[PDB]
Design a protein around this nucleic acid. Structure first.
Ligand SMILES: [Zn+2]
Lengths: 59, 191, 95, 91, 84
RNA sequence: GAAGCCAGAGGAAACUCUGGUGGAGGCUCGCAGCGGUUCUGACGUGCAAAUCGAUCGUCAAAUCUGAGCAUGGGGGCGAAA
RNA sequence: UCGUGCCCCGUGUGGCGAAAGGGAAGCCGGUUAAUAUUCCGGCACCUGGAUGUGGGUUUUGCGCGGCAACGCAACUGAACGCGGAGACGACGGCGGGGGCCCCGGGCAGAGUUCUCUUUUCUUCUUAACGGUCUAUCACCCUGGAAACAGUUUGUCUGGAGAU
RNA sequence: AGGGAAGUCGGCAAAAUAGAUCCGUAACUUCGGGAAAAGGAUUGGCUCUAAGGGUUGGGCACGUGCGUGCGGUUAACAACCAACUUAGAACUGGUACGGACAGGGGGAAUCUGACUGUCUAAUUAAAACAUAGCAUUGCG
RNA sequence: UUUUUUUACUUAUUCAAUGAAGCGGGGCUGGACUUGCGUCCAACUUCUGGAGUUAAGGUCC
């Protein structure tokens, strides 16, 4: 209950997830998010290429 | 103890595809010789995610993705219907009927072996840890692998205190007084 | 064979062993080959593969652990990833 | 300097419990108190926290394992036949 | 004494939204607006509208809680119900 | 004075020896506490409807203990007398 | 406004149960025949409410600085979510801090004194609440370690980046 | 006093032992123990000696109390500060030196229960009970 | 019309699960066999300890 008496900048760190997650974990979150969305784009490109090849083979 | 060790309820995702969960903690359950695994799945119907409690198979670890469903792969920790695994596969927490969230092969170092399949009537013949043969519906689920903590009974307890510590959290009757050491009014063996 | 090629590169060529020096080599763009151990964390593995794709550097997935990769390099310490900057007299680049 | 001839870690039990029982418990105590190499990070920092629970001090990975060893031979053989069955099913 | 909780006194007790007033009087919206026009209930503006309602916007109408309490005793409510 | 660890001396290595370090045990002497072995003990219409002295068992745990709560006589509880 | 309706959401169900568990916040001095962290004096704190002033932000609308760990008097944030605290065994030695104990000097007072004893003894204190400067762990930057290094009473740490 | 278990059903009771330093310690053994086994040598006071620690502190050349470029590991030296242990020696009193207090008697065996633990509050604490280990039966 | 045997069914009765969420039957699409078009079987996420919620949009008013 002592945290309700002190101001906001003393209870947090000026960063995303500040005062809730540490800097190493935030860096890991950023890198993992970026790499996984890039891999999703790559997988979607590969799936579209395979679908186009299958459609060309069927037609 | 916080929660019982059960599978997810048999829903549409497990019936028709697969759903992914993440293993967050592997914890000690008092009174049970086997560790438990806390696994978080998504809810397919709402934004909040759901935490489950499974009996942990050996080789499972924190941060591991596991998969529950009909179309899940054949990997340790995945939960599959018995019709989705080949013969010779050993599994844990096998449901007696599809949906009771696990009945057979639950203690440490134990498993159930898929002996065979009868696909016409949708049945599966399995071998139990006691050596018995059972026939279950093929939609019954099981977790691939062997329950962790095997070899627990090999170590001698060596001490009355260690037996007391074992049975205090298990509620089993300890110490055990022989019926022949009693009076005839206390036991039929009394006297 | 890859162990023999690696020993030839340690004897003749130039390498940097370790994650931070490998990343510095990839940023410099003078890295000729990257070796990533099998038990490297998947996040770091994806990061190294992205860096090597952006720098157009070949990647070899070493099937041993970091202990085995350090032993193959001839060191008494583990190594999860390493960069070959100069092949020396070896043909490790021709593959 | 070796201090005991044969009892080893069972020397804490003194003359109690019987020689065969102390020798039987010695194997389990040695394996359950030894340090193991982590399969994830390669450091020799994996140790038991509870029965069947093995954690690495360095990379903080917790693994479900055997009661007194990290892996059991039954589970290793099971992993081998699981890989064989998965290869047969996929092929 | 026992510690007070936040939001249990002050402007939160002083003001009520139109939705809350309609639900308190158990009227329909046309009957409520008719009764407000006839009895002289006027819209009010709190200094901080979030203290009264956390979902309130710039177009949220507020009334005095005492005015709605006074509306509870108006005999026209039973006339409305009898006509229905 | 158990594992683990350091050094020195050997041994092809495994290991062997020596000196340290470490601090395990329902280990041990023993204060409090808990208990209750012995004594031609005290007391025997007592200080006491079970007390007093000396002596003794145990003393890091199957140790001692308060409060809350549960089990009720065809019953309960019982390391069982 | 077809004015007498429509939409969103799912989690279940209440109460009792601890003057040793959890928990918002008060200290010092004085005062009575008998109460005192409760009375008096001084100096504070917590919880909730209303509404001002100053300061801040904004014409690049919702601050700036540091590579970073992060800092600073402020520096918007509903639904719905995630996380932390509350919140935790026993034992062993090691290190830091308060209080107590011990030693030396000094002022003041007391006792001893046939002889001796620059002697023996007593007071020499500093609260809550705040400000400021500091304090193991850990984390960040540079850099790249075998002739391996750092290091605890206890051998752990380091190319997953040590010194 | 002298004798020393002649007493008594029975060494019951009492006496003897006892701390610490050092020498030394058997059978048996589940190799862990037995073990403080057994059996020995010593201990006061005074005056000294020796050993075991801490803190601070290096020459040049430039810019100007800090930055470089050097140079040297005899600081193996100085200054200041501090505490309790251990070992060795002389001298000295003695009927006593762990001077009160505190404080194992020891040994050879037999039976018996494995051990630690527990019970008949108020006549029985034990070969009784429990125990770990072992074996059987039932249950999918 | 009735008595026995087995042999199906579901509506009484019984059991279990869930926030009573996707059951049964068709349609669309793809693949296999078949007859020369009926079955059955499949749609949907697997390198990573991230995130996923207030419908974006299309089209008629
Ligand atoms: Zn690890």
């Amino acid at each position: 209950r002592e945290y309700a008496t002190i101001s906001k900048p003393k209870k947090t760190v000026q960063r995303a997830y500040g005062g809730s997650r540490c800097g190493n974990c935030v860096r890991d979150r950023i890198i993992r998010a970026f790499l996984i969305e890039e891999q999703k784009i790559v997988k979607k490109v590969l799936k579209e290429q395979s679908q186009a090849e299958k459609k060309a083979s069927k037609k | 103890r916080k929660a019982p060790a059960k599978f997810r309820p048999l829903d549409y995702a497990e019936r028709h595809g697969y759903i992914r969960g993440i293993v967050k903690e592997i914890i000690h359950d008092p009174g049970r010789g086997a560790p438990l695994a806390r696994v978080v799945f998504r809810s397919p119907y709402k934004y909040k995610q759901i935490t489950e409690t499974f009996i942990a198979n050996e080789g499972m670890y924190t941060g591991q993705f596991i998969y529950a469903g009909k179309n899940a792969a054949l990997t340790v920790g995945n939960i599959l219907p018995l019709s989705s695994v080949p013969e010779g596969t050993v599994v844990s927490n096998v449901e007696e009927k599809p949906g009771d969230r696990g009945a057979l092969g639950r203690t440490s170092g134990n498993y159930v072996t898929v002996v065979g399949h009868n696909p016409d009537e949708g049945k599966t013949r399995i071998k139990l840890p006691s050596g018995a043969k059972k026939v279950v519906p093929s939609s019954s689920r099981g977790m691939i692998g062997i329950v962790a903590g095997g070899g627990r009974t090999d170590k001698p307890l060596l001490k009355a205190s260690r037996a007391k510590h074992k049975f205090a959290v298990k509620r089993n009757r300890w110490p055990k007084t022989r019926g022949v050491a009693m009076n005839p009014v206390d036991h039929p063996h009394g006297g | 064979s890859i162990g023999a090629k690696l020993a030839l590169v340690i004897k003749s060529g130039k390498v940097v062993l370790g994650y931070r020096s490998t990343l510095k080599a990839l940023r410099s763009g003078k890295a000729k080959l990257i070796l990533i151990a099998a038990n490297t964390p998947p996040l770091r593995k994806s990061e190294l593969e992205y860096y090597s794709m952006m720098s157009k550097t070949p990647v070899h997935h070493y099937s041993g652990t970091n202990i085995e990769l350090g032993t193959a390099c001839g060191k008494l310490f583990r190594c999860s990833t390493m960069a070959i900057l100069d092949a020396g007299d070896s043909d490790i680049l021709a593959d | 300097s070796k201090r005991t001839k044969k009892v080893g870690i069972s020397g804490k039990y003194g003359t109690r419990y019987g020689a065969s029982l102390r020798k039987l418990v010695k194997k389990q105590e040695v394996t359950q108190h030894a340090r193991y190499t982590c399969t994830f990070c390669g450091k020799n920092s994996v140790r038991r926290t509870a029965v069947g629970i093995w954690s690495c001090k360095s990379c903080k990975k917790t693994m479900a394992g055997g009661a007194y060893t990290v892996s059991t031979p039954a589970a290793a053989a099971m992993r081998s036949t699981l890989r064989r069955l998965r290869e047969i099913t996929e092929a | 004494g026992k510690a007070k909780k936040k939001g249990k006194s002050g402007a939160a007790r002083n003001y009520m939204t139109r939705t809350q007033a309609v639900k308190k009087l158990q009227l329909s919206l046309p009957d409520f607006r008719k009764l407000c026009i006839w009895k002289g209930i006027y819209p009010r503006e709190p200094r901080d509208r979030r203290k009264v309602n956390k979902s309130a916007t710039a177009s949220t109408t507020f009334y005095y809680t005492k005015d709605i309490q006074y509306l509870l005793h108006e005999p026209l409510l039973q006339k409305f119900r009898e006509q229905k």
